[PDB]
Design a protein around this motif. Structure first.
Motif, PDB file in Angstrom:
ATOM      1  N   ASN A 165     -27.241  23.543 -58.584  1.00 44.83           N
ATOM      2  CA  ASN A 165     -26.983  23.770 -57.288  1.00 44.83           C
ATOM      3  C   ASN A 165     -27.416  22.624 -56.463  1.00 44.83           C
ATOM      4  OD1 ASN A 165     -27.782  24.409 -54.408  1.00 44.83           O
ATOM      5  ND2 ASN A 165     -29.064  26.460 -55.044  1.00 44.83           N
ATOM      6  N   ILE A 166     -26.521  22.109 -55.800  1.00 41.43           N
ATOM      7  CA  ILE A 166     -26.442  20.783 -55.358  1.00 41.43           C
ATOM      8  C   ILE A 166     -27.077  20.893 -53.829  1.00 41.43           C
ATOM      9  CG2 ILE A 166     -25.057  19.689 -56.613  1.00 41.43           C
ATOM     10  CD1 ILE A 166     -22.849  19.873 -54.474  1.00 41.43           C
ATOM     11  N   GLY A 167     -27.382  22.188 -53.134  1.00 42.03           N
ATOM     12  CA  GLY A 167     -27.784  22.112 -51.967  1.00 42.03           C
ATOM     13  C   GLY A 167     -27.337  23.403 -51.028  1.00 42.03           C
ATOM     14  N   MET A 168     -27.669  24.335 -50.745  1.00 37.59           N
ATOM     15  CA  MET A 168     -27.560  25.337 -50.053  1.00 37.59           C
ATOM     16  C   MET A 168     -26.667  26.272 -50.672  1.00 37.59           C
ATOM     17  SD  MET A 168     -26.853  23.317 -46.279  1.00 37.59           S
ATOM     18  CE  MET A 168     -26.703  24.870 -45.220  1.00 37.59           C
ATOM     19  N   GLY A 169     -26.718  26.176 -52.076  1.00 35.53           N
ATOM     20  CA  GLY A 169     -26.159  27.170 -52.680  1.00 35.53           C
ATOM     21  C   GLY A 169     -24.754  26.570 -53.283  1.00 35.53           C
ATOM     22  N   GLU A 170     -24.314  25.217 -52.990  1.00 34.03           N
ATOM     23  CA  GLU A 170     -23.057  24.785 -53.318  1.00 34.03           C
ATOM     24  C   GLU A 170     -23.023  24.250 -54.766  1.00 34.03           C
ATOM     25  OE1 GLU A 170     -20.132  23.924 -51.161  1.00 34.03           O
ATOM     26  OE2 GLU A 170     -21.320  25.740 -50.426  1.00 34.03           O
ATOM     27  N   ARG A 171     -22.157  24.252 -55.222  1.00 36.41           N
ATOM     28  CA  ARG A 171     -21.959  23.735 -56.486  1.00 36.41           C
ATOM     29  C   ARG A 171     -21.129  22.513 -56.771  1.00 36.41           C
ATOM     30  NH1 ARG A 171     -23.989  27.695 -59.385  1.00 36.41           N
ATOM     31  NH2 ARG A 171     -23.626  29.870 -58.697  1.00 36.41           N
ATOM     32  N   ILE A 172     -21.098  21.655 -57.726  1.00 34.76           N
ATOM     33  CA  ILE A 172     -20.718  20.459 -57.923  1.00 34.76           C
ATOM     34  C   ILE A 172     -19.091  20.632 -58.051  1.00 34.76           C
ATOM     35  CG2 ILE A 172     -19.921  18.589 -59.614  1.00 34.76           C
ATOM     36  CD1 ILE A 172     -22.763  18.839 -60.500  1.00 34.76           C
ATOM     37  N   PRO A 173     -18.149  20.305 -56.907  1.00 37.63           N
ATOM     38  CA  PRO A 173     -16.702  20.329 -56.859  1.00 37.63           C
ATOM     39  C   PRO A 173     -15.979  19.512 -57.712  1.00 37.63           C
ATOM     40  CG  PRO A 173     -17.520  19.230 -55.033  1.00 37.63           C
ATOM     41  CD  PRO A 173     -18.732  19.329 -55.925  1.00 37.63           C
TER      42      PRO A 173
END
Length: 251
Positions: free
Chosen positions: A83-91
């Motif tokens: 989780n790289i913040g706010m539920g985002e994943r590494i793209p």
């Protein structure tokens, strides 16, 4: 030449997507930068263990995610667990091109010379005219040029000692721009920075201004005093920079 990067209007890119307000190097931040009026974004890339180009600034995922490790040693599936913040994943770089408008500008900063071959391949499939490849590492740029000698390239500079090498590096690498930090102003002084930029521009090079501190754009009217000497600004706070340039009456 390249009409996507050679324009009469100043180009605004979001730094790491839009790192003043959204998770750095995330798809969410990239969408939000475009919605806020940026012309495009700058992103940082590395090659995973299983040969996938992923976005991350540091050489480890520790700072920006809830996990630990060096992405170069981790497979993409391992990485997609963070989780790289706010539920985002590494793209991945492919995922970035899926979300970007086809005419949006993308400055790919190669942090990993191993990634150059795959970056070149992916760029070729995704409208290279709107891409700028940059790096602090001459050897990453040299490697990239083995695969792609036409995409716009910028040399990031963080050392005064690089500046005298620029004429030769322009020829060796087919550089379009030199990509200069606003932090040069406090460190070396405004006038010496101005005269250095002037000299680089006299070589036929364009200029990208970047910073880790957006206050440096605005204090002492630094960016205003450089009007006419830069083509691209990479801002952490896209909204603030878009509004500023419009208030000056120039964008």
């Amino acid at each position: 030449g390249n009409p996507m990067w050679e324009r009469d209007k100043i180009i605004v890119l979001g730094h790491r997507g839009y790192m003043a307000k959204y998770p750095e190097n995330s798809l969410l931040s990239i969408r939000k930068a475009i919605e806020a009026g940026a012309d495009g974004v700058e992103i940082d890339v590395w090659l995973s263990k299983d040969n996938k180009v992923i976005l991350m600034h540091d050489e480890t995922i520790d700072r920006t995610s809830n996990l630990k490790g060096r992405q170069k040693e981790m497979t993409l599936e391992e990485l997609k667990k963070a989780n790289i913040g706010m539920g985002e994943r590494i793209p991945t770089l492919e995922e970035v091109f899926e979300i970007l408008p086809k005419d949006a500008l993308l400055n790919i900063e190669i942090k990993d010379r191993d990634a150059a071959k795959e970056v070149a391949r992916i760029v070729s499939e995704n409208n290279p005219e709107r891409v700028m490849i940059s790096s602090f590492d001459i050897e990453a740029l040299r490697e990239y040029r083995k695969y792609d000698d036409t995409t716009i390239m910028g040399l990031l500079v963080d050392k005064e000692e690089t500046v005298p090498l620029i004429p030769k590096l322009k020829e060796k690498l087919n550089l379009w721009s030199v990509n200069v930090p606003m932090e040069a102003i406090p460190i070396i002084g405004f006038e010496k920075t101005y005269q250095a930029i002037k000299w680089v521009r006299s070589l036929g090079l364009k200029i990208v201004l970047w910073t880790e501190d957006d206050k440096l754009f605005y204090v002492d009217e630094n960016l205003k005093r450089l009007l006419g000497m830069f083509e691209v600004v990479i801002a952490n706070d896209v909204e603030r920079m878009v509004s500023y340039l419009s208030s000056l009456g120039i964008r």
